Amino acid sequence: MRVVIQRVKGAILSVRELEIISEIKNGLICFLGIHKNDTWEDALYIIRKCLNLRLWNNDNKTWDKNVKDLNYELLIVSQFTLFGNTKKGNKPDFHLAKEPNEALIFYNKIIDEFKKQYNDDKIKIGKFGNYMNIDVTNDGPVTIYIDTHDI
Amino acid sequence: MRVVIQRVKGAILSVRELEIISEIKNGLICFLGIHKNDTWEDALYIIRKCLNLRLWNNDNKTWDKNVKDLNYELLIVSQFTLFGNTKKGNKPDFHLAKEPNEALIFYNKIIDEFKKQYNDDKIKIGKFGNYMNIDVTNDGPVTIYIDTHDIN
Numbered sequence: 199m200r201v202v203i204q205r206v207k208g209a210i211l212s213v214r215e216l217e218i219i220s221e222i223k224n225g226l227i228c229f230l231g232i233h234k235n236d237t238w239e240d241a242l243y244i245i246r247k248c249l250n251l252r253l254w255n256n257d258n259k260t261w262d263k264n265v266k267d268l269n270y271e272l273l274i275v276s277q278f279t280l281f282g283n284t285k286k287g288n289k290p291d292f293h294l295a296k297e298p299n300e301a302l303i304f305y306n307k308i309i310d311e312f313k314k315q316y317n318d319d320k321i322k323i324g325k326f327g328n329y330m331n332i333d334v335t336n337d338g339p340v341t342i343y344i345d346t347h348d349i
Numbered sequence: 350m351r352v353v354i355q356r357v358k359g360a361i362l363s364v365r366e367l368e369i370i371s372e373i374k375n376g377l378i379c380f381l382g383i384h385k386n387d388t389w390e391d392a393l394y395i396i397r398k399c400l401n402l403r404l405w406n407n408d409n410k411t412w413d414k415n416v417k418d419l420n421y422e423l424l425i426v427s428q429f430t431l432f433g434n435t436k437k438g439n440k441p442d443f444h445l446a447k448e449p450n451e452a453l454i455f456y457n458k459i460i461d462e463f464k465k466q467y468n469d470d471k472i473k474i475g476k477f478g479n480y481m482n483i484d485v486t487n488d489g490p491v492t493i494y495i496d497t498h499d500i501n
């Protein structure tokens with residue numbers, strides 16, 4: 199599994215003129231690429247790290263407070279394109295990303311888990327597999343990348 | 350190097366209440382991270398991929414046109430945090446990132462190569478090593494991740 203985590207002052211998600219469906223203020227936004235080979239353990243790691251990484255400075259100390267401590271929110275977006283690859287070819291290909299049926303199952307398990315470990319009010323989501331437009335207010339900015347096949 | 354590309358309809362870059370310094374309409378934001386032991390080969394590759402990746406749909410076809418095909422802009426932001434090491438502990442470690450002085454000079458050699466291979470006015474930068482506020486209208490969203498270390 200893969201995650202691009204971006205720290206933000208706020209993010210406004212929309213769908214088709216567009217109408218707003220999701221919204222967060224301070225917190226994180228996590229672009230979530232699910233790999234064909236993702237066991238539920240791959241998911242677990244992504245979640246803990248998303249919730250317990252210390253990305254906010256604290257009236258004193260840098261890289262200290264996580265999303266939970268500061269009572270901030272999370273926006274988890276499905277990103278098939280995180281495995282959009284490298285080999286010669288400027289077109290991407292997402293045949294390394296989990297098959298988009300078993301993936302939707304997985305993704306929604308993940309969001310239960312996010313809620314079950316945080317607080318269900320604090321996990322705002324996307325329309326899985328739809329076109330979205332997201333205004334993001336990157337703060338820093340700060341961009342964490344994480345890949346669970348590295349372990 | 351590692352790069353995080355997002356396809357965008359627009360992007361406004363602020364520094365220090367805040368000040369705007371950089372703005373693109375349709376194009377890409379590249380969050381660029383520079384490894385301690387990066388080479389000029391690595392940098393070339395990244396430039397080739399931002400510039401050449403076909404991410405915009407066109408007529409009947411998906412993933413058809415690249416940033417250049419469409420005369421779209423690019424905003425290039427240094428991002429040492431891409432080398433945050435989160436394997437041990439929940440306080441990230443930025444040790445494998447190039448150090449600011451050395452990384453600044455590289456970054457600039459990376460920018461100028463963008464302006465070389467493309468055109469000046471399509472390349473926007475932030476302020477290196479300063480807090481920035483960046484409103485990114487995310488188009489899709491489409492988020493690409495290349496890391497050149499997985500190559501030769």
Ligand SMILES: Nc1ncnc2c1ncn2[C@@H]1O[C@H](COP(=O)(O)OP(=O)(O)O)[C@@H](O)[C@H]1O
Pocket residue numbers: 260429442443444446447448449
């Ligand atoms: N490559 C880098 N580029 C820019 N800033 C860095 C880099 N590495 C570390 N820092 C800064 O230093 C802090 C964490 O690393 P540092 O203090 O340099 O080493 P250590 O974590 O061993 O004390 C952070 O506040 C970060 O802003």
